[PDB]
A paper describes a structure:
The PI3K-related kinase (PIKK) [name] monitors the progression of metazoan nonsense-mediated mRNA decay (NMD) by phosphorylating the RNA helicase UPF1. [name] is a member of the phosphatidylinositol-3-kinase-related kinase (PIKK) family, which also includes the ATM, ATR, DNA-PKc, and mTOR kinases. Despite the confounding name reflecting a possible evolutionary origin with a lipid kinase, and in retrospect the ability of some PIKK family members to bind inositol-6-phosphate, all active PIKKs are Ser-Thr protein kinases. These large, multidomain enzymes share an overall similar architecture: a C-terminal catalytic module (comprising the so-called FAT, kinase, and FATC domains) and an N-terminal α-solenoid (that typically serves as a protein-protein interaction module). [name] and [name] form an unusual G-domain heterodimer.
To address this question, we reconstituted purified wild-type [name]-8-9 with an excess of [name] (instead of SMG1i) and subjected the sample to a similar single-particle cryo-EM analysis routine. We obtained maps for [name]-8-9 and [name]-9 at overall resolutions of 2.8 Å and 3.1 Å, respectively. In the reconstruction of the binary [name]-9 complex in the presence of [name], we observed no ordered density at the substrate-binding site, consistent with the reconstruction obtained in the presence of SMG1i. We concluded that the autoinhibitory conformation of the PRD in the insertion domain of [name] is connected to the presence of a nucleotide in the ATP-binding site and is stabilized by the presence of [name]. In the binary [name]-9 complex, the portion of [name] that interacts with the N-terminal HEAT repeat helices of [name] changes conformation, exploiting part of a binding site that was occupied by a short N-terminal segment of [name] in the ternary complex. Indeed, two hydrophobic residues of [name] (Leu456 and Leu457) take the place normally reserved for two hydrophobic residues of [name] (Leu351 and Leu352). Hence, the conformation of the [name] segment observed in the [name]-9 complex is incompatible with the binding of [name] to this part of [name].
Numbering used by the authors:
A (entry chain A): 2139 to 2232, 2245 to 2426, 3607 to 3661
B (entry chain A): 615 to 626, 632 to 684, 698 to 877, 881 to 895, 900 to 1060, 1067 to 1099, 1103 to 1151, 1178 to 1259, ...
C (entry chain C): 169 to 285, 293 to 343, 361 to 435, 454 to 519
The structure:
């Protein structure tokens, strides 16, 4: 990581990434920029602006590159870690453990009380055991870590209301964009929040284009809608500004899917792109998602139906109960 | 330099490097390093250059066109030098004063004649304006006043880019410890058109203030707040007696320490000082184990609970006259009462935040309190939670009374979450009302869906009112009341077939009735209001509810209807029965006594004052007989109408009230028309068609108020013999814009009324009555017909209009828009 | 509503009479609160100590000199060259800040008045000045030094010798240097650097706190002067007079009101360290000051110094 001092006496940090192509990442940013441009018309008649925060990446050859370092945002995981420390302090009145250690400690007895052991394959794991462990972990953690943080950060109630609305709109926009593009590996360290405005920012994009569905442990969640994420949106949850914002974003993307498809086609036939017929498959998947034929033989789903299906699948306990330990679903 | 000044001032050209170039480009190193150790030389150079340029009017006539050939490139150089010197943040006081005087002179001369219009497109002009904008908001007062005067001199013919910055600066300067600064910035803010002030752009100054407050809050407690300071602050907030004789800056300075970071330019703003004082008071209260000088650990809670409960009780029936909260000695007393009401809620919020952080903790937001305080707040957490839960409802009611929907929204959300197990209906209604006030239909819909999982479909109807669809909301409210009561109480309106196509408990019944009444009043339908009142009376007499009653002064409605209808005798008779100072035939006490701190009451009083002034002017017309008195009345009214804006700036709102801003602008326009007898363009309200592209998130009420106050001058033009400014064009423009906004939200009745009045109950009626703004009017008529449901008729008329426009002279956008829409 | 303030002193009260006697009349205006601040000033005949205290405690430059809380000199009295303030004055502002105004040191008027009234009156006046200086340096937090013309070469010697005659890990109050009636030449970078260097060389072994506090550069007085230009910016402030064909319209210094307000803000936020190893209240501080005064009156070092001369 380096820093550049400009003429206006303003420091600009950068991350010098090596041993990576970084060419596809640049295309992802251009796609996000065009998507943001598509929201300029409506942004002139609504207080909460429709924006998708992103940075700039410039490849410095074929194996190296530079990435803009976004400042002012902090990862959500940190908050969780802090809470653990606080809890530990209470134990001292009358070293925090890693998520993997806690998950294994809670899954050991559960598996040993049914017949299996810790040496059995992960694929041959009972669903009830995983669901019970997830429920216990969920009940052991509070969902006010993000809501209280945003509340205490603000100064006046007006600022609190504005920040909450901005956060909900940004979360909905990013959720729809990520689901359409096929973003994956949305762990706590890959999501940042800006306490000054409430907007959400994503970082890693190397597990995009449905690449997370084929790993040592497949994931079946379009985005991240954990307990702390849903609680910070309000008392209603995902039935208020979140659902409407998602529907509006999908409507805008569906109306102008021709430009997105053309850009994707141009991205497929690009010599400076390391996709490894894979590019054609990715293009077809994105096209089907935009056209509404995500999972259907010939039935074209509507925006409301698609939003409801994606929301239900992203918050289902069955899907969250069979995820990787690193992808903490309880917090 | 002094000797050279002799030849510099001579008006007679080669002779070695000319004086202009010698003191402009040749002598430029003095502004880099010599200006730090020897500012006398820099000041002398600037003074001689200014003395030489002022003799030839800064060479303004040389441009836009011998000596003229050489001086043709002098104005741009002068402007560039002035701007580059102004952006420097390390200038001397004398140099800055001289540069400001030079800039003011140039700005005043630059509007002298029409011909200098192209000069406003040069880059040097933009640089100069940027320097002027960056020179204000400084510690010096005279410099700020000079910059404000210069900016106001050339306010017109200025790009919106600088206008937005001007709006932000004026908004921040509205709350200053000096009266001259506030008075000077008020005029500048009033000169900016409403199409830019009501824009949804972001304000940088407000963000800086918020950042400074956040930085101070995140710091560790200093524990330097003495008990006397807390006693004085609490005494002023609770009783209004500060017991101190600029007492905020002095206190802030006395609370600092040099042995152990708010900007120095922000210490002159009352908003930052008030927020800092409130935060310090709450910090001291929490760190003192609740044993504040007000009493014991329970005395403080009892006092706060009693005051909050009294205010909440008075909110239900605004006829209690709470001591120290409803009576005032003059006009400033009411403003102080409103300020105190806002500070009370802010203090309560800060106290709750600190208590939560003390028993639970945060992460990088607030520093952890000491162990002695943590254990105390950890063992007695149940008592604090119970007290907050018991006073939450009262706090929500107080928030609704003080016009702060955010406070009640947050409290309602917390109360709803805590009730995870009929006190729920009242909480839901209060939350919905606050959401409606904040214009958030999505939140209302979400609340309705969430509550449906526990028979509350009426909530959805409220959502419509939040979007500005008053016509549909009124019908929905009537249907809901008819279904929940079993007695027919509908009112005649437009056909529901096309209306729907274009777009129990006693408390709920009363709430719905009041909502429908306010909804009808919003679109300015006096006849509908009277019919609604009659229907409500009939329903009450047929049910013996004894608990239903509209909370709206009917005398005020009758007066407004009479004034708009053109009848002044009945209007004066109705106004004579309203409270407050008698109608014009002392000036400080214009508002009546025992006035509630509700902003709606203040708005009503201001509207009544405006009506009285208008009636007096009309009677006097049919120039100092009835002019020296009305001017003072209007001036005081304008002075009282600026209170809401200052209150909005006190808190980080990032927005400005629409009703308050419009009332202030209307008052200023009325004062100008009274003092000028409609002789200048400044007497017209600034609401042009540009707002159609930057105010799409506002309701139709603004245009209603503007039209109500514009029709008066339009009809009054017949009583003036001297030449006046053209008002027909402005009136038609306002009518067209209002019709567009009314039609875009389903208000077919209001849109039809506006279109009919501009052109000078069934779908077929519009078709039979309708089949420089001519083309626009025709396009709007066709659009209205299409929206109603007659696509064939609208298309036929649009096609005919397109053919007629193709044979016109200009037909620039008429033909294009007609064919595109077709 | 029983939290009303004690009282608002409309005028100051003499704490020490001309006969150098303790007056017990300011206790009624004090409370039982801690963390109090006290200020003192040592100056010459016409430096303007009373005016400074008035403008910094409860007065503004716009107010008339006849309503000052501290009796200032009058034009009709400057002809005879006599002193205006006698003894020590007391006044507490609404911010719980105690102020103390003293009489001029080595004032010829006092000596002349004493002539027409143990060896020689000169030693008597000298010991009186030493006693007042010691008392101030013993029960004060910050002491402001007012001056008319720079390079006096006599005030520093008096301050240095006054620290060795105090009654009693020691407490050293802060010393603030103020230059009253400053001219335009004094507001120059070269003159400022010269003044700073001269003060540093003259107070090498002052043993008191006179650096790192009340920085005039940090107050935006000199927007272009860099902080590295001065080797050690000591606590020095300037105050000009109350509100030319070569340089017409050039003042050369900021407004008098601006500088006065800046000085007031900087002084109001001065540090308040513990005077002794115990928390003192307003009444406790008054009692401690009275005891210290009684002890310094009948001391031994002062008598020896007076006898040696
Ligand atoms: O009534 P107009 O003054 O002609 O407003 C029209 C039009 O209004 P309609 O919805 O009644 O047709 C639309 O306004 P919004 O939908 O943004 O509120 C929008 O056109 P769209 O319907 O396609 O959105 C836009 O027209 P355009 O998109 O061409 O800019 C706009 O203004 P103009 O027609 O004058 O451009
Ligand atoms: N633009 C950015 N702004 C701020 N932080 C960033 C940015 N890009 C990366 N980071 C941080 O840098 C850290 C290092 O990323 P890293 O985990 O090494 O990615 P990766 O190595 O390419 N994928 P993996 O090999 O699975 O770890 C991330 O966890 C982020 O917190
Ligand atoms: N900055 C100033 N500008 C102009 N006149 C001043 C200024 N400061 C002080 N003076 C004048 O000089 C005289 C100073 O006398 P003052 O009583 O204020 O205090 P002093 O010099 O400390 O005297 P004393 O010790 O005898 O009380 C007064 O006449 C006052 O008006
Ligand atoms: Mg004096």
């Amino acid at each position: 990581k380096l820093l550049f001092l400009g003429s206006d006496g303003k420091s600009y940090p950068y991350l010098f990434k090596g041993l990576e192509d970084l060419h596809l990442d640049e295309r992802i940013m251009q796609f996000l920029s065009i998507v943001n441009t598509m929201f300029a018309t409506i942004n002139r008649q609504e207080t909460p602006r429709f924006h998708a925060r992103h940075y700039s990446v410039t490849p410095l050859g074929t194996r190296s590159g530079l990435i803009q370092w976004v400042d002012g945002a902090t990862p959500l995981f940190g908050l969780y870690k802090r809470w653990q420390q606080r809890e530990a302090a209470l134990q001292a009145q009358k070293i925090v453990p890693r998520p993997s250690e806690l998950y294994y400690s809670k899954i050991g007895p559960a598996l040993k009380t049914v017949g299996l052991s810790l040496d059995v394959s992960r694929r041959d794991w009972p669903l009830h055991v995983m669901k019970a462990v997830l429920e216990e972990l969920m009940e052991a953690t509070p969902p006010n870590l993000l809501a209280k943080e945003l509340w205490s950060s603000c100064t006046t109630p007006d600022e609190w209301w504005r920040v909450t609305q901005s956060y909900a709109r940004s979360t909905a926009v990013m959720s729809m964009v990520g689901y359409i593009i096929g973003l994956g590996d949305r762990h706590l360290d890959n999501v940042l929040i800006d306490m000054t405005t409430g907007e959400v920012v994503h970082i890693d994009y190397n597990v995009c284009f449905e690449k997370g569905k084929s790993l040592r442990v497949p994931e079946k969640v379009p985005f991240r809608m954990t307990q702390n994420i849903e609680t910070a949106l309000g008392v209603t949850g995902v039935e208020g500004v979140f659902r409407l914002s998602c529907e509006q974003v999908l409507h805008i993307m569906r109306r102008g899917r021709e430009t997105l498809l053309t850009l994707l086609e141009a991205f497929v036939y690009d010599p400076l792109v390391d996709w490894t017929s894979y590019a054609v498959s990715v293009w077809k998947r994105v096209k089907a998602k935009l056209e509404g034929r995500d999972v259907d033989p010939n039935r074209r789903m509507s925006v409301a139906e698609q939003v409801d299906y994606v929301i239900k699948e992203a918050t289902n306990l069955d899907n969250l109960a069979q995820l990787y330990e690193g992808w903490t679903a309880w917090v | 330099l002094s000797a050279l000044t002799t030849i510099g001032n001579a008006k007679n050209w080669a002779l070695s490097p000319t004086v202009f170039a010698l003191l402009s480009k040749n002598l430029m190193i003095v502004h880099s390093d010599l200006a730090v150790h020897f500012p006398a030389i820099q000041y002398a150079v600037l003074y001689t250059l200014y003395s030489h340029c002022t003799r030839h009017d800064h060479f303004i006539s040389s441009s836009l066109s011998t000596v003229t050939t050489a001086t043709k490139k002098h104005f741009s150089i002068i402007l560039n030098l002035l701007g580059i010197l102004l952006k420097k943040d390390n200038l001397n006081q004398d140099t800055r004063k001289l540069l400001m005087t030079w800039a003011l002179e140039a700005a005043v001369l630059m509007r002298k004649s029409e011909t200098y219009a192209p000069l406003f497109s040069l880059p040097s002009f933009h640089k100069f304006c940027k320097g002027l904008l960056a020179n204000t908001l400084v510690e010096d007062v005279n410099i700020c006043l000079q910059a404000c005067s210069s900016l106001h001199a050339l306010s017109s013919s200025l790009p919106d880019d600088l206008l937005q910055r001007c709006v932000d600066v004026c908004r921040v300067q509205l709350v200053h410890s000096g009266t001259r600064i506030r008075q000077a910035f008020g005029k500048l803010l009033k000169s900016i058109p409403l199409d830019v002030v009501l824009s949804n752009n972001n304000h940088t100054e407000i963000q800086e203030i918020s950042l400074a407050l956040r930085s101070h809050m995140s710091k560790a407690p200093s524990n330097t707040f003495h008990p006397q300071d807390f006693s004085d602050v609490i005494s002023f907030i609770l009783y209004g007696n500060s017991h101190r004789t600029n007492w905020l800056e002095r206190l802030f300075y006395s609370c600092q320490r040099l042995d152990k970071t708010i900007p120095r330019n922000l210490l002159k703003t009352d908003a930052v000082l008030w927020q800092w004082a409130i935060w310090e008071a709450a910090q001291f209260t929490v760190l003192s184990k609740l044993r504040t000088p007000l009493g014991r650990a329970q005395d403080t809670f009892q006092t706060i609970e009693g005051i909050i409960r009294s205010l909440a009780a008075h909110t239900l029936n605004p006829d209690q006259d709470v001591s120290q909260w409803t009576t005032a000695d003059n006009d400033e007393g009411h403003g102080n009462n409103q300020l105190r009401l806002v500070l009370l809620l802010q203090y309560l919020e800060n106290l709750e935040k600190l208590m939560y952080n003390a028993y639970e903790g945060c992460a990088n937001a607030l520093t952890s309190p000491p162990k002695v305080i943590r254990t105390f707040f950890y063992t007695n957490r149940q008592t604090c939670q119970d007290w907050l839960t018991r006073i939450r409802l009262s706090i929500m009611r107080v928030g609704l009374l003080a016009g702060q929907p955010a406070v009640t929204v947050r409290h309602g959300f917390d109360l709803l979450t805590e009730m995870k197990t009929n006190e729920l209906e009242v909480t839901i209604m209060m939350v919905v009302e606050a959401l409606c006030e904040l214009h958030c239909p999505e939140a209302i819909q979400g609340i309705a869906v969430w509550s449906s999982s526990i028979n509350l479909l009426w909530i959805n109807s409220v959502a419509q009112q939040a979007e500005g669809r008053f016509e549909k909301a009124s019908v929905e409210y009537q249907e809901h009341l008819c279904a929940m009561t079993g007695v027919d109480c509908c009112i005649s309106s437009f056909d529901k077939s096309v209306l729907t196509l274009a777009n129990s408990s006693p408390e709920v019944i009363n709430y719905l009735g009041n909502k429908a009444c306010e909804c009808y009043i919003s679109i300015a339908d006096w006849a509908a209001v009277q019919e609604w009142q009659n229907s409500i009376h009939d329903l009450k007499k047929s049910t013996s509810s004894t608990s239903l009653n509209l909370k709206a002064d009917f005398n005020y409605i009758k007066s407004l209807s009479s004034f708009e209808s053109g009848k002044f005798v009945e209007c004066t008779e109705q106004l004579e029965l309203l409270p407050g100072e008698n109608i014009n035939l002392d000036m400080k006490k214009l508002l009546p006594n025992m006035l509630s701190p509700d902003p709606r009451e203040l708005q009503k009083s201001i509207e009544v004052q405006l009506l009285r002034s208008s009636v007096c002017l009309a009677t006097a017309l049919n120039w100092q007989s009835i002019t020296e008195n009305v001017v003072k009345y209007l001036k005081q009214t304008s002075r009282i109408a600026i209170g809401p804006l200052r209150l909005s700036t006190l808190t980080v709102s990032q927005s400005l009230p629409v009703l308050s801003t419009l009332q202030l602008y209307c008052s200023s326009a009325l004062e100008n028309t009274v003092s000028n007898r409609l002789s200048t363009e400044d007497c017209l309200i600034p609401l042009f068609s540009e707002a159609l592209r930057s105010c799409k998130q506002h309701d139709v009420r603004p245009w209603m108020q503007a039209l109500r106050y514009t029709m008066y001058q339009n009809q009054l033009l017949e009583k003036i013999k001297e030449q006046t400014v053209p008002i027909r064009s402005h009136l038609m423009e306002l009518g067209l814009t209002a019709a567009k906004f009314a039609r875009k939200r389903g208000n077919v009745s209001l849109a039809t009324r506006l279109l009919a009045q501009c052109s000078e109950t069934t779908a077929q009626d519009l078709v039979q009555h309708f089949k420089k703004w001519g083309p626009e009017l025709d396009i709007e008529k066709t659009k209205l017909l299409y929206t109603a449901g007659q696509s064939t008729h609208a298309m036929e008329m649009l096609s005919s209009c397109a053919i007629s426009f193709c044979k016109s002279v200009k037909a620039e956008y008429a033909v294009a828009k007609s064919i595109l829409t077709l | 509503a029983k939290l009303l303030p004690p009282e608002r002193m409309k005028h100051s009260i003499k704490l020490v009479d001309d006969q150098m006697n303790w007056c017990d009349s300011a206790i009624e205006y004090l409370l039982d609160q801690t963390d109090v601040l006290v200020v003192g000033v040592l100056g010459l005949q016409g430096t303007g100590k009373s005016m400074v205290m008035s403008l910094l405690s409860a007065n503004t430059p716009e107010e008339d000199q006849r309503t000052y809380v501290f009796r200032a000199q009058s034009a009709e009295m400057k002809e005879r060259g006599g002193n205006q303030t006698s003894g020590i004055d007391f006044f507490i502002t609404q911010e719980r800040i105690v102020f103390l105004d003293t009489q001029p040191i080595l004032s010829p008027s006092i000596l002349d008045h004493l002539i027409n009234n143990y060896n020689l009156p000169h030693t008597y006046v000298e010991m009186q000045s030493l006693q007042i200086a010691a008392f101030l340096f013993t029960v004060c937090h910050v002491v402001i030094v007012v001056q008319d013309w720079f390079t006096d070469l006599s005030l520093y010697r008096f301050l240095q010798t006054a620290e060795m005659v105090k009654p009693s890990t020691e407490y050293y109050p802060h010393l603030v240097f103020l230059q009253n009636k400053a001219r335009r030449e004094d507001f120059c970078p070269r003159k400022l650097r010269q003044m700073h260097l001269m003060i540093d060389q003259l107070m090498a072994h002052s043993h008191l706190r006179y650096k790192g506090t009340l920085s005039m550069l940090q107050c935006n007085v000199f927007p272009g002067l860099p902080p590295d230009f001065l080797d050690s910016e000591v606590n020095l402030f300037l105050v000009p007079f109350m509100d030319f064909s070569l340089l017409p319209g050039y003042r050369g210094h900021p407004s008098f009101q601006s500088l006065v307000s800046k000085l007031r803000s900087q002084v109001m936020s001065m540090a308040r360290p513990q005077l002794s190893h115990t928390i003192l209240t307003e009444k406790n501080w008054f009692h401690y000051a009275a005891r210290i005064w009684d002890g310094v009156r009948k001391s031994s070092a002062l008598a020896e110094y007076s006898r040696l001369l």
